[PDB]
């Protein structure tokens, strides 16, 4: 440890003492890297320990198992469970491996050399050394580029992943033909984020999700080598701030935006987050209501096309503002929905009247009856209805836990951006301590 | 001189000698706010009535259509549009734009982009004067709050009709419909924000009283007490030890700040942290994580249910659940 | 009155805190305040021009 009178940093801003201490700081990230793996192993074994494999997975309050189950471990057709031993392995694998990271986090933080500059020259770095930073950048682009390939190799050689758009209920599919067309891949990035377009949440097939990772696997290896052999150009010297805290706040601006995207992708995308495992989306559970309550007129035989509502709009089926046959009611706002239990009921002109009255599979209504009940709107003590719903059931969707947590986690990092990116800009200039009281600028300016 | 056309231009934007500073956030703040201001005035005065719910019953919002200041509003975008980007050119005629909820989505997109950048130039001028930069952090507490009621809440609901209208009576409907669906008063983030402003007003009434009550005698009694301070002076205008000495007697000595730099941090940190939770409150309530729900919770033996106050607040919410959007719901759940 | 006083608690607490006078050398700027000092702790001129 240290003290305040040698560094000017109190007990609460204490981790800022080890900015210029390379070796302690290395132990600080390794120890924290242990806790991420340690949370991954402990929470996985905890959720396996309370897992009833006959009820659906999203009903039991689970968030880490559908991540493993999307990859296709112990799952069968329609979202069923075969065996829960691979869910036990990864919780065991992370938990033992965290102690290996745990020992290195204790070691370098206490006994290992506090500045690994002159002893270990490959590892020693000064924050203004630009060539060394672009090296340490460029090494990790490989380690983060190779990790993209593991998903590609597991989807093309090692059994494949859960493709929820497979016919007759989704199951595990080896994606043989990845869509690698650059015009198809980069069409998502420069697409608008508003409704009907949906910037990157609207990737609808498994053919692209692993198809995209071939790009980001290749680029981060091509880009990783680029920063090893090059230094930043003189416009990048005229643009950025080259301190230690400045590199942090650049990152905090990035992973603030990362949180808002995972906030939205777990709320809208039922392709990377399949509805059999994470539960239905908000738009899926609302569109499940009007479909199941259109089956509840076919048993009585009234005309769903001629069913006029109270406002003269159509009780069951009406027309989109771009002219398509959609559902009606207050669920008209969700007409941009697509789902594998409903897409075999759509023709050119939206969904077909002749097809809906005749060509309903029995399993499609069976899935669209669970999705009426398990709508994601709940409460905070896990009641699970509308706010005017009494203490009867105990359910709130993992989509609602992931969208709320990763909004707030991905929000304060933007406040984390505005803290450090202002402070690093100030302290590089000189006046982070305050006004000089002798030669200050405002006394040397004109009025008004 | 030998300076370029561009360098002449950059030594004018970043010039601090201007009456209002522009900066590089202000070159895209100023044309967005003047866009959003000048269209807000027109739709507050001359907008034709907007179908808000898609059921083709247009709601009036203009002063020229028999409204006053309180009932005037800029009506949100229709339910049939939802989250589709609906600019002025996608509409065939201009009146088709106005009837469908046009100028709501034009204002909010230019407003929110404007106030993200008004936060920007609060940093930028503070770098141009040698100030420490964290006023831009403190302006993020309303910016977090205004981003939620206009943008983060229509995402989780799926439509810009459920966002907040730009009207005084328009706001009051949005407060009622929200608590009917989400029970905001029984959510601890709204409890923090309520303490954020009741604490925030107390910490301004109390701090501002003691500085007035310790002013040094420099004027007469006919002249106002504000004439003792002359602008830009160096010596302190009020006794600080006397105010800590007063407030130390008042409750106890440990319950005060003697360090005035630690005092003014506490005045900044208390409401700003408090508004951050009530900004994240309805951000999490946008994704349907409502609040507490203690309905039918206190029960005795023989299976009977005793009322609490939480069952009384149920009856208020249940009386407003079955009244908002009165001609919309064809089905016995309010999923949208 | 309530929302207006909450705004004056947040600005004055932040305007003072960001126009402080450099009087110490540690970056913990709460340490540099002898409360019996005759001079003020922030710059009312600079805070005006901001």
């Amino acid at each position: 440890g240290r003290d305040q009178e040698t560094t000017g940093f109190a007990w609460w801003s204490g981790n800022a003492r080890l900015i210029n201490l390379s070796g302690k700081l290395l132990g600080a990230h390794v120890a924290h890297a242990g806790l991420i793996v340690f949370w991954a192993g402990a929470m996985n074994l905890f959720e396996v320990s309370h897992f009833v494999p006959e009820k659906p997975m999203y009903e039991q309050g689970l968030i880490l198992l559908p991540h493993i189950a999307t990859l296709g471990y112990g799952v069968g057709p329609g979202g069923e469970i075969i065996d829960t031993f691979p869910y036990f392995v990864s919780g065991v694998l992370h938990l033992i491996s965290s102690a290996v990271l745990g020992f290195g986090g204790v070691y370098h933080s206490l006994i290992g050399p506090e500045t690994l500059e002159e002893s270990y020259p490959f590892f020693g770095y000064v924050w203004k050394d630009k060539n060394k930073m672009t090296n340490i950048l460029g090494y990790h682009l490989i380690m983060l580029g190779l990790g993209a390939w593991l998903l590609v190799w597991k989807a093309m050689y090692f059994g494949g992943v859960y493709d929820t758009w497979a016919p007759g209920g989704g199951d595990v599919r080896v994606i043989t033909n990845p869509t690698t067309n650059a015009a198809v891949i980069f069409g998502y990035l420069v697409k608008s984020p508003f409704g009907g377009d949906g910037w990157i949440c609207s990737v609808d097939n498994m053919e692209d999700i692993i198809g995209g990772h071939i790009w980001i696997g290749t680029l981060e290896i091509l880009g990783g080598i680029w920063h090893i052999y090059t230094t930043p150009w003189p416009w990048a010297r005229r643009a950025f701030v080259w301190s230690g805290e400045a590199y942090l706040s650049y990152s905090l601006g990035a992973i603030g935006v990362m949180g808002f995207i995972a906030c939205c992708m777990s709320w809208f995308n039922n392709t990377a987050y399949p509805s059999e495992f994470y539960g239905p989306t908000g738009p899926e559970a609302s569109q499940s209501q009007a479909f199941t309550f259109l089956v509840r007129d076919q048993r009585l035989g009234a005309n769903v096309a001629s069913a006029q509502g109270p406002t003269g709009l159509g009780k069951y089926l009406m027309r989109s503002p771009t002219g398509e046959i959609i559902f009606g009611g207050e669920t008209m706002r969700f007409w941009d929905f697509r789902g594998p239990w409903l897409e075999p009921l759509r023709g050119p002109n939206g969904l077909d009247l002749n097809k809906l009255k005749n060509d309903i599979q029995p399993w499609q209504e069976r899935r669209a009856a669970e999705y009426m009940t398990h709508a994601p709107l709940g409460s905070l003590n896990s009641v699970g209805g509308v706010a005017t719903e009494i203490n009867a059931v105990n359910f709130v969707s993992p989509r609602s836990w992931l969208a709320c947590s990763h909004f707030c986690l991905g929000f304060f990092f933007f406040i984390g951006h505005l803290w450090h990116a202002g402070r690093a800009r100030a302290a590089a200039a000189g006046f982070e301590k305050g006004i000089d009281r002798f030669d200050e600028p405002v006394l040397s300016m004109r009025p008004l | 001189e030998n300076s370029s056309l561009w360098a002449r231009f950059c030594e004018w934007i970043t010039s601090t000698e201007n009456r209002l500073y522009i900066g590089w956030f202000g070159v895209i703040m100023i044309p967005c706010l003047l866009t959003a201001t000048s269209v807000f005035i027109i739709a507050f005065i001359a907008a034709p009535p907007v179908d808000i719910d898609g059921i083709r019953e247009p709601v009036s919002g203009s002063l020229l259509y028999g409204n006053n200041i309180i009932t005037g509003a800029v009506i949100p975008t229709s339910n049939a549009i939802g989250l589709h980007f609906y600019p002025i050119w996608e509409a065939a005629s201009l009146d088709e734009w106005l009837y469908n909820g046009g100028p709501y989505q034009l204002i909010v997109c230019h407003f929110l982009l404007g106030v993200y950048c008004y936060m920007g130039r609060e940093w930028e001028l503070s770098f141009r004067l040698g100030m420490r930069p964290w006023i831009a952090v403190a302006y993020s507490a309303p910016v977090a709050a205004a981003s939620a009621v206009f943008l983060v809440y229509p995402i989780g609901q799926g439509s810009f009709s459920d966002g907040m209208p730009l009207g005084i009576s328009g706001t009051f409907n949005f407060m009622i419909v929200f608590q009917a669906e989400h029970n905001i008063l029984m959510h601890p983030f709204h409890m923090l924000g309520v303490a954020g402003v009741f604490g925030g007003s107390l910490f301004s009434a109390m701090h501002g009283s003691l500085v007035t009550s310790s002013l040094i005698r420099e004027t007469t009694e006919n002249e106002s007490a504000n004439e003792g301070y002359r602008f830009g002076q160096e010596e302190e205008t009020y006794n600080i030890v006397a105010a800590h000495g007063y407030f130390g007697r008042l409750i106890f000595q440990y319950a005060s700040f003697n360090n005035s730099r630690s005092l003014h941090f506490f005045l900044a940190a208390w409401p700003v942290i408090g508004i951050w939770f009530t900004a994240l409150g309805l951000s999490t309530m946008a994704f349907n994580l409502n609040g507490f729900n203690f309905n039918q919770s206190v029960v005795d033996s023989q299976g009977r249910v005793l009322n609490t106050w939480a069952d009384i607040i149920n009856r208020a919410n249940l009386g407003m659940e079955v009244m908002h959007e009165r001609n919309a719901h064809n089905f016995p759940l309010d999923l949208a | 009155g309530v929302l207006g006083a909450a705004l004056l608690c947040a600005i004055h607490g932040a305007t003072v805190e960001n126009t402080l006078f450099e009087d110490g050398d540690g970056a913990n700027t709460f340490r540099a305040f002898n409360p019996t000092q005759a001079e003020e702790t922030y710059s009312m001129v600079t805070a005006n021009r901001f």
Binding site: P447 | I45, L63, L64, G66, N68, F231 | -
Partner: peptide
């Protein structure tokens, strides 16, 4: 009738806000 009385009092408030910025009493140091 009152629809033009309201708009007088709105742009009347915006009048002072113009005059309170650019034609303010200029603060003089010391």
């Amino acid at each position: 009738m009152e629809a033009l009385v309201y708009t007088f009092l709105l742009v009347g408030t915006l009048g002072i806000i113009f005059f309170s910025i650019f034609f303010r009493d200029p603060p003089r140091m010391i």
